[PDB]
Design a protein around this ligand. Sequence first.
Ligand SMILES: CC[C@@]1(c2cccc(Oc3cc([C@](C)(N)c4cncn4C)ccc3C#N)c2)CCCCN(C)C1=O
Ligand SMILES: CC(C)=CCC/C(C)=C/CC/C(C)=C/COP(=O)(O)OP(=O)(O)O
Ligand SMILES: OC[C@H]1O[C@@](CO)(O[C@H]2O[C@H](CO)[C@@H](O)[C@H](O)[C@H]2O)[C@@H](O)[C@@H]1O
Ligand SMILES: [Zn+2]
Lengths: 313, 407
Amino acid sequence: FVSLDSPSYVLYRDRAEWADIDPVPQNDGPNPVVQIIYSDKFRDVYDYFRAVLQRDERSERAFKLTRDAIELNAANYTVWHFRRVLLKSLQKDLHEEMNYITAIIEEQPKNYQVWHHRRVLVEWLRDPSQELEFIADILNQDAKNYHAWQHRQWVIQEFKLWDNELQYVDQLLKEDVRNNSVWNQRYFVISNTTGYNDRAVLEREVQYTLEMIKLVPHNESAWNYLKGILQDRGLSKYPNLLNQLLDLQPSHSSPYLIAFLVDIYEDMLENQCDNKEDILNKALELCEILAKEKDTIRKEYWRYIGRSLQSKH
Amino acid sequence: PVWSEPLYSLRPEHARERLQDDSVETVTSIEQAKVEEKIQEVFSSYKFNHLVPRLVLQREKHFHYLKRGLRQLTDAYECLDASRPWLCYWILHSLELLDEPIPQIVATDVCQFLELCQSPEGGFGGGPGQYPHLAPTYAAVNALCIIGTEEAYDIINREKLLQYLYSLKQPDGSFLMHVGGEVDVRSAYCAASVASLTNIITPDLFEGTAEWIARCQNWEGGIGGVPGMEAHGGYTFCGLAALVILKRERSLNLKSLLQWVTSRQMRFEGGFQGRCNKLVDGCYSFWQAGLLPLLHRALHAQGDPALSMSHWMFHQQALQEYILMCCQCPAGGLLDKPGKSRDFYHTCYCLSGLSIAQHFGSGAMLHDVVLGVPENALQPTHPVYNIGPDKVIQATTYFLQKPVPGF
Ligand SMILES: CC[C@@]1(c2cccc(Oc3cc([C@](C)(N)c4cncn4C)ccc3C#N)c2)CCCCN(C)C1=O
Ligand SMILES: CC(C)=CCC/C(C)=C/CC/C(C)=C/COP(=O)(O)OP(=O)(O)O
Ligand SMILES: OC[C@H]1O[C@@](CO)(O[C@H]2O[C@H](CO)[C@@H](O)[C@H](O)[C@H]2O)[C@@H](O)[C@@H]1O
Ligand SMILES: [Zn+2]
């Protein structure tokens, strides 16, 4: 009806349709702490919200009131909870509420309550038809919004909408190959569809990642993804990878490449590799190089790795 | 000389740690470069050729900022009207870290206020009359323990608190943040924290929880809000801290987690980022760096012969340099990064992180590294609960003398 910023907005204490119920002030005690000096409009709405809640009034007026309470503080989980109780009691049109939550999330995308509310609605309706496109719009404004990605994974998994996600992942990686949220989604999609056991799929992924690394040598996400899809089986189980990385050593070098080499050597030593002493010496030299020159911020970590290698092999 | 102290961030070789975008620009590298340019300017303002004055934590300014916020706040804090116990906790913990005494009158007033926030169904809400929620419940319990008086301890309705936790427990081991709310790793931490402090843990309360948390660790090594999601410092701290409380750290791949968190420290800024390829932020001084003392204890329990006996596995000096030079508001209070405004949340976590960076402790070994003037030394903080270690022992001892509600 009327928004909190509308020129014709009227305080609830002045509304005739609300005259029959007494507002309930918030009791902060005689000697308040962390006392917020609320604006008159804020307190007005919450004094009446407290009244309807305490009275557990499942009414249309109470429903409209929650909308104002939310605008004043969208992080108030108690209001959202009551609004959901009202949606059910009043048998409100859920598609209408979806249009409402859509606008709200667009305005405040970094809020836990709005995304949870939307999930509840999709669950109640068992209708995910608007989700992927809506999420895509949010991500178009902030490609790393954590809540957006979490909601996207839930929808895809709950309603089995895997068909076009890898294509979506590739598009976002084209836009920003450094978007770690997208590499995470990539793993999410593959691990839940084909899996990484299919050697053809793994080869495709290792090739894809290596190409991205050659394109942007200092992008940590690609390096982390490479290790991520190979670590469970063991980095030493892929002999050709060591050589290829060793070839890029002189040129496409970086702390990421050197660190990856140490990780390979660690696994090799842990798997009774041949020429153990030689491998250990190479690993230790690299740990020193990393600690003293190429990755000094992680000096303590690399020194620890050097000592660990010596205690184990 | 005692009046000059060389800094890691000011070394000439440090310029080599600047971002290398490989001549391929994307929104990510552009934002990272912008932050780095600003940070370099700040770093340079603390160097006068070979003269490098000791860094100073503006204790008194922070103290006055905190003292004021504990009583009143402008309507600018309306957005936190559902998190008032958090304001109490952030402020009380900051004062505690600064070794600033809390007047008896203030302590009693906080106790009374938190009592008003406590729900008859158990737990605490974000304000008087609000529904209980694990986030403010965690904050309220911590605040009460920081005060540490029997008056504070007794405010907690332990019988209802345990019932409330039960009312949020899911069959897969996870917990809801509140009735009809959402689930993510933060809930497990909030629940484990308050349950262990108040001695209300039952054998089945956290049945399955450790396994659920482990499912949240992902390919990166860190932990996401829920299984499948991107690793983030906030959720990773909650996950490991919860497992430490449950003594189930081994449920995780501690190796991949260690490599992940250490990688989150920014080679140039010195501070920590929340997730790979995002920006440095002062609050991660606690959420991320706080994972190292936890990992240290976990590995130590396993008998790791390679663990250090004097340092955490991150650059303690660089973190202190980032916090002291880039996260202090001239008017008092701390923040995310230069250009951002101060707030009590960042004041609490920047200080908590600074304390962790200054103090190493393992077994009978203690080794301090207080950068700058000696007065910068803060009181220690417990890596699991993030309240003074003395407060943890005192609370646990007190509550251990009471039985678990209804056994
Ligand atoms: C600040 C108030 C509070 C909180 C408390 C303690 C720790 C918090 O960590 C967060 C901080 C941020 C915040 C303020 N955007 C931020 C500041 N610096 C980094 N980040 C990510 C966002 C989300 C979370 C979470 N959970 C967040 C209350 C409890 C309910 C959770 N949310 C939404 C919050 O806003
Ligand atoms: C006990 C408790 C409540 C712990 C929570 C700790 C914590 C800091 C959680 C962060 C959660 C989150 C959604 C971050 C993304 O925000 P962002 O995108 O603004 O930040 P980013 O760019 O640094 O990732
Ligand atoms: O850091 C990897 C490490 O995490 C575990 C859980 O503790 O599994 C995660 O990572 C795997 C990829 O490496 C995913 O398949 C799995 O779903 C995710 O939970 C460990 O098994 C692994 O060693
Ligand atoms: Zn922050």
